[PDB]
Design a protein around this ligand. Sequence first.
Ligand SMILES: Nc1nc2c(ncn2[C@@H]2O[C@H](COP(=O)(O)OP(=O)(O)OP(=O)(O)O)[C@@H](O)[C@H]2O)c(=O)[nH]1
Ligand SMILES: Nc1nc2c(ncn2[C@@H]2O[C@H](COP(=O)(O)OP(=O)(O)O)[C@@H](O)[C@H]2O)c(=O)[nH]1
Ligand SMILES: Nc1nc2c(ncn2[C@@H]2O[C@H](COP(=O)(O)OP(=O)(O)O)[C@@H](O)[C@H]2O)c(=O)[nH]1
Ligand SMILES: [Mg+2]
Lengths: 437, 49, 426, 430, 11, 126
Amino acid sequence: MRECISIHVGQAGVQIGNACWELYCLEHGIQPDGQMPSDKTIGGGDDSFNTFFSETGAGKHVPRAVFVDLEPTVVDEVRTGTYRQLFHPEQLITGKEDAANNYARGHYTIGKEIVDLVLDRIRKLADLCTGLQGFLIFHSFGGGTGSGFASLLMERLSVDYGKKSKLEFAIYPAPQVSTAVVEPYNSILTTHTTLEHSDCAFMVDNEAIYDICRRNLDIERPTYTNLNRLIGQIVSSITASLRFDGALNVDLTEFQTNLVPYPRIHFPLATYAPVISAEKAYHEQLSVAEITNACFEPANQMVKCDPRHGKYMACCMLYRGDVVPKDVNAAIATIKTKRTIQFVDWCPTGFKVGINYQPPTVVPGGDLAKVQRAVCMLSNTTAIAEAWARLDHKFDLMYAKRAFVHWYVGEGMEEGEFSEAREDLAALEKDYEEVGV
Amino acid sequence: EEVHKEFQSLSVFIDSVPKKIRKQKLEKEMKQLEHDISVIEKHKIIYIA
Amino acid sequence: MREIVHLQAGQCGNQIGAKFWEVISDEHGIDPTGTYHGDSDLQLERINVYYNEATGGKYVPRAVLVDLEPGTMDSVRSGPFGQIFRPDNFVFGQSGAGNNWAKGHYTEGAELVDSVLDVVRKEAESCDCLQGFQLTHSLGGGTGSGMGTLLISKIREEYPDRIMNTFSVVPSPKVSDTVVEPYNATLSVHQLVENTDETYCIDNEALYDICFRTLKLTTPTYGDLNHLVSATMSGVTTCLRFPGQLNADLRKLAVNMVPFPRLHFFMPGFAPLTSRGSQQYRALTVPELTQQMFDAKNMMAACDPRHGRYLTVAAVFRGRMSMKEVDEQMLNVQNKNSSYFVEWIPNNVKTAVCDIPPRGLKMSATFIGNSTAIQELFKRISEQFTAMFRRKAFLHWYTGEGMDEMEFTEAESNMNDLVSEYQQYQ
Amino acid sequence: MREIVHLQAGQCGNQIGAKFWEVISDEHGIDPTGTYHGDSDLQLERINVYYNEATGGKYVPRAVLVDLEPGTMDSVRSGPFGQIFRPDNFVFGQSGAGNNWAKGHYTEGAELVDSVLDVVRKEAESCDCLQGFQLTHSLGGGTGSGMGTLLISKIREEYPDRIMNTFSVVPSPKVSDTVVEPYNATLSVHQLVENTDETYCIDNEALYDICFRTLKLTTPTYGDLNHLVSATMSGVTTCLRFPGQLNADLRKLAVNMVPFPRLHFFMPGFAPLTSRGSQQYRALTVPELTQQMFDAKNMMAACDPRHGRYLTVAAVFRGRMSMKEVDEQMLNVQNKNSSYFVEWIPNNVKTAVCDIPPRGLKMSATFIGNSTAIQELFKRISEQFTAMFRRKAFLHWYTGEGMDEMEFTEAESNMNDLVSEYQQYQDATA
Amino acid sequence: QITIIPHAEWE
Amino acid sequence: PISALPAFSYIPPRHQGPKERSYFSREGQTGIVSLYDCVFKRRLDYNQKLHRDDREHAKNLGLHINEEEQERTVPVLMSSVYGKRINQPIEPLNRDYGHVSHVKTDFYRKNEIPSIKGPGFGHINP
Ligand SMILES: Nc1nc2c(ncn2[C@@H]2O[C@H](COP(=O)(O)OP(=O)(O)OP(=O)(O)O)[C@@H](O)[C@H]2O)c(=O)[nH]1
Ligand SMILES: Nc1nc2c(ncn2[C@@H]2O[C@H](COP(=O)(O)OP(=O)(O)O)[C@@H](O)[C@H]2O)c(=O)[nH]1
Ligand SMILES: Nc1nc2c(ncn2[C@@H]2O[C@H](COP(=O)(O)OP(=O)(O)O)[C@@H](O)[C@H]2O)c(=O)[nH]1
Ligand SMILES: [Mg+2]
């Protein structure tokens, strides 16, 4: 029975877990204590809250997540937060010292101390689950822990569970704004493991949610919590088919099959619609055609790239709320009758439509006004590789003069892994070019 | 406190003889006051003559 | 769990360290008695980075105070917050160095170093996981520029992995109070470059310059100079003690500011330094601080960054804001003053935000930058030192300690090599 | 049930015994009159190990105070706890020995040993089940170094099975107040090694160093030294006196402490010694207690243990506490200082626990060590003795008392053989 | 279970 | 001295005035009124939860930071920001669309072997 396990690693992973688990608990009715006000007894939906929560002997519901950080305070704030008794104590795992923005430190020196502890914890959650669907793993490329420890942990999980699918959600370094100067090295070195040990990954850059939140939602002063809320809503849109019934329910394996044409091409881009504030939502009627047209606007992409500069390979629509398949068909005909939207010649039919019933909810302290229908789009296209190209340019300008190499070398890795990963990314960009041909 | 703060204000290296005597004067008071507070905490009832 | 040991050498560093221990006591809520009278319990969560615990809720500092003269010891012993320190940590000699580096480093050095290792050890095993060492001294004294270079030499052999940071005070040629100052400094800079992860250069003349013009105070004493240094040290570690949106530590920056192991001299800055009458015509906003540390007049040392290229830049913000505009102001200043940044490193600026603001002002930021302007500071010392050494003036004092003349040439050669490779990186 | 008989010899032994009886009377809540005014029931449960019952609810110390000079008895009787001792327990001659071991041991000792044996036999047949004898003297005296060893010989003949321990004050080479001190030392050490189950060596120079630096007292009188020795002597037997989590006694420590009968010399130590300045800045914990008892400066003897190898170590803890910090801390202090412990004995550390804290404090610890460094002081006594003896100096005072010339030779041979086997046990392969 | 102090001591 | 008196240093002991004169609220005492009681009247017991008696509140013992954030009108801790106003009322939860396991709740039972014997009291009257 459908169950998914969270492996949130890094400060980004922990904060995303904060947002997401708040969203799940208010989606299902969980109080912060761990007792819903009405479980089973009066009606009661057993299948509703066992994709994420598990029942205990005292009738409390435990999240199916693992919070891992090599620094204490980011998880200590959760241990002292309002969900202290909601979370499991041994689930929250901390370290005394961190990688300090070093992939090498997070991969070879400090990760091996607690890798056994996190893998035994994950084995316990896998014991708890009966039919496991996949692991949602949240991290960033820039942070040393969130790169090195994430890479080592998922390369352990690959041999631990050969078939059990892994969904990698990660923060992509932004083209212009940056919070570190050693992040290109860590991203380049992470990309090898993210290529060889992933089935589907959702690298996102902060600048896109910044500009979208400013333009559509009218908040002049955005913070990280709004981005985390949007990411959590995207994940809830993904998992709505597992949580709640629909006319065309879509399992994770369904879009895994219908999003990946070739094994090396598993880097889709996700988008959500609609994102409007209440004051403007007063005036504008919302329908399927308008929201699905909002999906295809390049200004609403969560990754800084123009799909008009590339070609769509596959597209997965996840409609949610009060939507009707006739309107989906009308919208898809309207979309297909556009010259600006391009598709590869080996995909005349490039759409995976799924439909749910329950509308998305709104989170207290949130930003989005309530909208009775919503949609998520997962587009596999070739316009993403230019971000890898500019990251390669930044890495090359770093690596010509051997800057910051001494930190990694004194840690103790071998230097040609840098050039090896550069070659691998050049090959990946070449493969994307071949598909673009 | 003022005796001990004076004891605390005291020089760490004490080479001179008039230093060496003024250390003791506080300790004579220090032992006395500690003795008095010790015995009054022994019981709450004070039957005295 | 994450601890810092705060060494204390020389008359300058002792008064600077005394001021620092007062300031952070006024951030965590410690009376001169030593009890926690704090209001927020957030003030008492991470106090064990700087303080050790004692019976009855007593907090003792993790500071080892050393000086070759017991007289300056009594001064801090008579200070306002002089009562918190442990007298066992008070280790001192009997005869001073007379501002002679070789006397400190060699002659009067061997006897008292052994005592200070034991306490430095004793604090080290007290903490379960020690992040690294903190030491304050002046590069113009006999102990701190002397002994102090000897202490860091031994502890790097004994704790190699641990980070050592030094708030070393750098002499100015414009206002000089020592004439053998080039001799002791040139024999000190060689010690820092071979063993130091990060160094901060601080000049008293620019600290006077800020008080004269940025603050316009009528009589800046040495107490005002020390607090301005002290607030920077609290601005370094504010993200370690208190949580913030983008947490960081001393190692988060340490890897981020060092492109090559030779370059570890930085430009500390404090953002909210405004004159007294300016507060009336003011409206506290984030870009105001952004304009405030990116002028060279706010710099606390004696070199203009407009004469060099900024290699790496950090601005650690302390207080509650949001990150969107501070990235814009990061991006705005990077595109505007592109010439003064290096081309081979895009995104030269690393930012961190801690939520807890300082007492007395909502908004505070600490700027730590590595620029090519620091090469104008070593060159000016060699201009003086070679004038001394060409005539062999003031040599019999150092030669009286038994050391050779070869040490002078290598120290100049190392600093000449340092500024040569520092010039090729421009 | 398990009684201790306190033998008290010489001026030094008399003073330290007076201090020790004062301290244990403080612990058991006994006034200078003789009545019990303590509060807790456990303060009077095993009082009969040092105290004999007397009518009117009185308790008399179970000690025998012997001296050839009547002068020190007047001071003892004039002390604060002076009238607590039974007058019949005082055995004094009319003239002393004048620091002459031969006069103490042979000529003038013979008349008074009969009286001492009479009172000791009465005292021994008082108690039903006697654990043994605990003696206090100095090897540099005339009586304690002299007739005290003769009493040890007679008692070891009389009661072979009972445990006897000597808290012996050993002279220092640096600070010396007698010239025939090496003569008395070499003529005594032979007796102690021939019949002694355990010796605790205390040195006044080391005690003075403790007074100088650890406690920082400006005018350290001999009362300070006697108080410290009293604290050590109490801490030895606190476990026997009071219940604990892991009880022990004199035989518990001695059987565990003596691998071979020739090695019974031990250095003592007391943990909670801090200056009044140091009391303010301290976190009183078992970690700091272990650090303080394992630093070699706190040692009560005149030998640095870092030049030898610790054969065996025992720690008796006083006060309420949890064993795990002790077991892990003895384990890690075994682990770091691996060079200073012998390899042919695993788990060189033996621990005992008593719940009742000392009065006026919450935690305390007493350390008893057998280490290789103690042979240094013996070899220095030999270096002094041979240098004085080679010129045949100061021997007429002894030779007028009727002994031969070969007793010095055999005592020197005995102590040379002892330090030889001590060094060969130092140099041993597993 | 009562403290007793002399008058001179109390003064 | 008066000249050695500083030029701008005005820092008292870290105590604030009224709640208006604070970044925070809820002013209270130190909790200790005599440092003689502080230094001397230490505790004979050892608490087993803490490994060091000096580290009295190392595991958040008797500290109510969450309670103080809910008391104060604004979340100072920025992670306390993300969940504060859940107590305010939100759109009633929609429940009718969620899976329920009819197969397990009907097909699968525990015991009671009904087919063999039917002598029960008050049954099979539909
Ligand atoms: N979207 C989002 N990104 C975050 C968040 N927190 C951190 N990040 C990103 O993560 C990157 C650094 O990684 P962190 O998660 O902060 O730290 P880490 O993963 O523990 O790795 P280290 O920095 O070495 O300790 C930064 O560049 C941020 O862009 C968050 O809450 N939301
Ligand atoms: N910033 C600052 N510098 C100081 C202070 N006190 C002394 N100094 C500097 O310290 C230098 C003298 O140091 P010195 O006492 O010889 O150091 P020592 O030999 O190591 O003890 C002088 O050049 C002063 O400029 C102070 O309070 N603040
Ligand atoms: N530690 C200590 N040693 C003492 C004390 N009184 C005397 N001594 C030592 O005893 C030695 C003299 O012993 P002595 O009186 O000749 O012993 P006696 O001949 O048996 O009476 C001196 O060397 C002193 O150091 C004391 O109170 N404490
Ligand atoms: Mg991190």
